Amino acid sequence: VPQPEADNLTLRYRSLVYQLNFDQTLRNVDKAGTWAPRELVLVVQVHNRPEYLRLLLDSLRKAQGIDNVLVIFSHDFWSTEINQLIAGVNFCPVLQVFFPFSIQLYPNEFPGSDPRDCPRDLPKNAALKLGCINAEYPDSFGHYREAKFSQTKHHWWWKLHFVWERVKILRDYAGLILFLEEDHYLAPDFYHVFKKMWKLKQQECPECDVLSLGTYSASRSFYGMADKVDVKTWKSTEHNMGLALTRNAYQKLIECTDTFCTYDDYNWDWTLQYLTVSCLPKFWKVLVPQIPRIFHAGRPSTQSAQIESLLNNNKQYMFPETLTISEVVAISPPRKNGGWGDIRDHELCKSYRR
Amino acid sequence: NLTLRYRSLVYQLNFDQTLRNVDKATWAPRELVLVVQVHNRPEYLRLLLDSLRKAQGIDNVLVIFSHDFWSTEINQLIAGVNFCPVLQVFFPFSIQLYPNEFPGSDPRDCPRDLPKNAALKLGCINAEYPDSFGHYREAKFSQTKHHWWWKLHFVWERVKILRDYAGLILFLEEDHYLAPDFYHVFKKMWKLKQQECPECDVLSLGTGMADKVDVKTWKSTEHNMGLALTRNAYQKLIECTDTFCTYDDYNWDWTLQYLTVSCLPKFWKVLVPQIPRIFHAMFPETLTISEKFTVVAISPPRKNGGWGDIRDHELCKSYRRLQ
Ligand SMILES: CC(=O)N[C@@H]1[C@@H](O)[C@H](O[C@@H]2O[C@H](CO[C@H]3O[C@H](CO)[C@@H](O)[C@H](O)[C@@H]3O)[C@@H](O)[C@H](O[C@H]3O[C@H](CO)[C@@H](O)[C@H](O)[C@@H]3O[C@@H]3O[C@H](CO)[C@@H](O)[C@H](O)[C@H]3NC(C)=O)[C@@H]2O)[C@@H](CO)O[C@H]1O
Numbered sequence: 001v002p003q004p005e006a007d008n009l010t011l012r013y014r015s016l017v018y019q020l021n022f023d024q025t026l027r028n029v030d031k032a033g034t035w036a037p038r039e040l041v042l043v044v045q046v047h048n049r050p051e052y053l054r055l056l057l058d059s060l061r062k063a064q065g066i067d068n069v070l071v072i073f074s075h076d077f078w079s080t081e082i083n084q085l086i087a088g089v090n091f092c093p094v095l096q097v098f099f100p101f102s103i104q105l106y107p108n109e110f111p112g113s114d115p116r117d118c119p120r121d122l123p124k125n126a127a128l129k130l131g132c133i134n135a136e137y138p139d140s141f142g143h144y145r146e147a148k149f150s151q152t153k154h155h156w157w158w159k160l161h162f163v164w165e166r167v168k169i170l171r172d173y174a175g176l177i178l179f180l181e182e183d184h185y186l187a188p189d190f191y192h193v194f195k196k197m198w199k200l201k202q203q204e205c206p207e208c209d210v211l212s213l214g215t216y217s218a219s220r221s222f223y224g225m226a227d228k229v230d231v232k233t234w235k236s237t238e239h240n241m242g243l244a245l246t247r248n249a250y251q252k253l254i255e256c257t258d259t260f261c262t263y264d265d266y267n268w269d270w271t272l273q274y275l276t277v278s279c280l281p282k283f284w285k286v287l288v289p290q291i292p293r294i295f296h297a298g299r300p301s302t303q304s305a306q307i308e309s310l311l312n313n314n315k316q317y318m319f320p321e322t323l324t325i326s327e328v329v330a331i332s333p334p335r336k337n338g339g340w341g342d343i344r345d346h347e348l349c350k351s352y353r354r
Numbered sequence: 355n356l357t358l359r360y361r362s363l364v365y366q367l368n369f370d371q372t373l374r375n376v377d378k379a380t381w382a383p384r385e386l387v388l389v390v391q392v393h394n395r396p397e398y399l400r401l402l403l404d405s406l407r408k409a410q411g412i413d414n415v416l417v418i419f420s421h422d423f424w425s426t427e428i429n430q431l432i433a434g435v436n437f438c439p440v441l442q443v444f445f446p447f448s449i450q451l452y453p454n455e456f457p458g459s460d461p462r463d464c465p466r467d468l469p470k471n472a473a474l475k476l477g478c479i480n481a482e483y484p485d486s487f488g489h490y491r492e493a494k495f496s497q498t499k500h501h502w503w504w505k506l507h508f509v510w511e512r513v514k515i516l517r518d519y520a521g522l523i524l525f526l527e528e529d530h531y532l533a534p535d536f537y538h539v540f541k542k543m544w545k546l547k548q549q550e551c552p553e554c555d556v557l558s559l560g561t562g563m564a565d566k567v568d569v570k571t572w573k574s575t576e577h578n579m580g581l582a583l584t585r586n587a588y589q590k591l592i593e594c595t596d597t598f599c600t601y602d603d604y605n606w607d608w609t610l611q612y613l614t615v616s617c618l619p620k621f622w623k624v625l626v627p628q629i630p631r632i633f634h635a636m637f638p639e640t641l642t643i644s645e646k647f648t649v650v651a652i653s654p655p656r657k658n659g660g661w662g663d664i665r666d667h668e669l670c671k672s673y674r675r676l677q
């Protein structure tokens with residue numbers, strides 16, 4: 001009997017992440033057929049909240065007409081319960097990718113917590129004399145790097161480039177890709193509205209850059225507002241939930257990698273808000289329905305019952321026959337939030353494009 | 355190192371045991387469980403997956419795929435299965451995981467057709483242990499018997515979803531094609547066993563008329579395509595582990611046939627339909643037992659060799675112990 005291996009957990013997780021990102025095993029699809037991603041592709045950034053991921057999977061199972069829509073789950077943490085919940089999805093194409101620069105893969109070194117890093121609340125005069133690595137590079141508020149807060153911005157930018165230029169099933173994909181999170185709940189007609197939203201964009205809003213499936217403001221009655229969409233300037237605090245990008249819109253973002261990776265803000269949506277006023281050629285105008293088709297559920301069983309009660313009471317207003325645009329200038333980030341002053345985070349973020 | 359990466363994948367996936375197409379938050383394995391031994395011939399695996407997709411009423415039957423070779427094309431074929439619960443386990447002592455060492459091809463192993471007097475002077479590892487025909491160990495011929503015996507113990511005592519499973523488990527291979535009514539007949543075969551053949555030990559999907567089944571003395575070489583065992587029938591096999599792992603025959607079915615005539619407490623009687631429901635590449639209303647052969651003798655099968663290396667003996671016996 002062969003001598004067993006030394007149980008290195010971090011080496012085992014890297015092996016799973018590296019192999020699955022290369023194989024790219026596609027679920028519920030017979031590749032020997034003529035299936036290709038079309039119109040819409042869902043990309044979900046997953047963390048470690050299985051109670052909210054299950055709510056998202058329940059909304060997808062109750063959704064209508066998504067039997068051919070590819071749903072990509074981008075993971076930054078390997079978890080048996082997380083992989084088990086997604087494995088139960090058999091009603092639509094499912095793909096799993098793993099962020100290969102997660103803190104779980106690097107415990108004792110960047111992008112994790114290097115033992116020579118400066119503490120968070122250590123003053124600069126003490127850090128310079130101590131001699132820690134990033135002593136000369138704090139953020140705009142004198143705070144130093146924390147690995148747990150920088151991973152989300154790294155993952156969002158890596159998964160944006162990965163699904164557009166590293167996923168072989170999305171080669172030459174000329175549709176839209178919807179970006180949501182694990183703590184989101186999609187309406188049963190979110191795909192029905194998106195198909196009419198994109199047709200309404202190609203006919204009445206040629207200047208619309210991106211699409212959104214709704215804001216955080218929802219009315220108790222969907223009467224008269226369920227078939228209406230608004231054309232507004234993209235605000236990160238109001239349109240960070242369910243963002244649909246195009247191939248042309250993605251190329252404008254990847255051309256702004258240096259500006260995205262150096263902006264001192266660990267929030268990806270606040271950084272995109274700065275892109276509109278700086279590196280992007282113009283600010284973004286978003287197409288969003290007056291009634292949201294996506295909800296932020298963040299107890300799980302309590303907020304889920306309120307969403308399903310809101311959608312059931314207004315079941316008559318969903319799935320509208322026709323959408324109509326109803327009757328706005330740019331907006332700058334009011335304040336940098338810091339957390340992205342370490343140049344090591346800058347260089348790692350810039351390398352995703354290469 | 356690719357082989358070192360595969361070892362890491364196998365250890366994690368055999369422990370996690372991710373169950374597909376099942377919402378664990380009220381499904382439990384019942385009646386029948388399918389266990390398929392997969393190697394590295396996707397052209398035949400696709401035929402088996404086409405037969406499963408065309409089968410009737412197997413939406414609740416768990417199909418476990420035991421792999422001895424990691425392949426992107428192989429893993430992609432099974433991921434497309436969305437119509438029944440799917441589980442993937444990996445044989446952790448395969449040649450892909452150990453290329454340059456046992457159970458693979460150790461660089462110090464003796465050649466196949468090297469005489470024993472030359473092997474003793476050369477000093478190769480297994481020089482003192484050739485098979486019954488003067489031939490030495492070949493890794494490619496020992497993997498099938500190693501995988502079959504490990505997979506028998508793993509699905510019965512190491513799969514958490516099959517804990518306290520009080521049903522039957524069907525064992526087939528990647529090069530098999532199931533009839534669309536194989537599960538329809540099995541459900542009536544087990545009902546027909548509980549009513550007209552209390553002495554039937556195991557069931558078979560084939561070796562006449564479409565509604566007739568026969569009761570014969572169980573020969574392993576005649577029922578190696580789609581073999582359904584019970585927990586009591588499984589326990590009889592593991593109690594004969596030393597005889598299975600030391601018998602000089604790399605074929606698992608020839609070894610099981612020798613197990614019946616030399617180690618089993620009593621002979622087995624098998625229920626098999628006259629028309630096979632499995633093929634090596636309908637839907638009757640009622641099944642009726644036709645031919646009922648009495649228990650007759652069975653001669654010791656001629657050994658084919660290929661299982662004389664004691665290293666294969668110890669590894670085969672250790673599967674029940676390793677944890
Ligand atoms: C409606 C509106 O415009 N609200 C603004 C409000 O969001 C700002 O608060 C800051 O929010 C960001 C992240 O915002 C995301 O999440 C919100 C949740 O509601 C969303 O609404 C929003 O769309 C975004 O998705 C936080 O990161 C900021 O936190 C930092 O600053 C606060 C100050 O109280 C501090 O308490 C936090 O601990 C954090 O401080 C930073 O922490 C990191 C890591 O520990 C350090 O590296 C970094 O140096 C710290 N910086 C500072 C300055 O201490 C806010 O909560 C609000 C402020 O801009 O404006 C409202 O208008």
Ligand SMILES: CC(=O)N[C@@H]1[C@@H](O)[C@H](O[C@@H]2O[C@H](CO[C@H]3O[C@H](CO)[C@@H](O)[C@H](O)[C@@H]3O)[C@@H](O)[C@H](O[C@H]3O[C@H](CO)[C@@H](O)[C@H](O)[C@@H]3O[C@@H]3O[C@H](CO)[C@@H](O)[C@H](O)[C@H]3NC(C)=O)[C@@H]2O)[C@@H](CO)O[C@H]1O
Binds near residue numbers: 485605656660
């Ligand atoms: C129609 C019929 O029933 N034919 C039987 C015939 O197949 C048997 O021959 C041996 O079959 C086994 C495998 O048996 C399985 O597959 C059969 C179909 O091919 C099924 O019919 C059967 O039910 C089983 O499912 C083979 O492994 C044997 O191959 C060995 O022996 C032959 C002949 O001597 C030799 O040419 C082969 O090369 C092989 O020899 C061994 O090879 C290994 C690996 O290199 C060596 O380690 C070992 O030392 C070699 N031993 C010998 C003796 O050379 C046969 O093909 C037949 C049994 O004799 O019964 C017929 O009824």
Ligand SMILES: *[C@@H]1O[C@H](CO)[C@@H](O)[C@H](O)[C@H]1NC(C)=O
Binds near residue numbers: 009011014
């Ligand atoms: C485990 O693996 C990681 C990365 O492969 C390595 O840095 C670490 O030293 C290993 N731990 C050991 C060998 O104990």
Ligand SMILES: *[C@@H]1O[C@H](CO)[C@@H](O)[C@H](O)[C@H]1NC(C)=O
Binds near residue numbers: 355357358453454
């Ligand atoms: C990987 O390591 C194994 C030993 O564990 C060794 O036999 C094999 O040759 C290595 N792979 C390569 C490509 O050398």
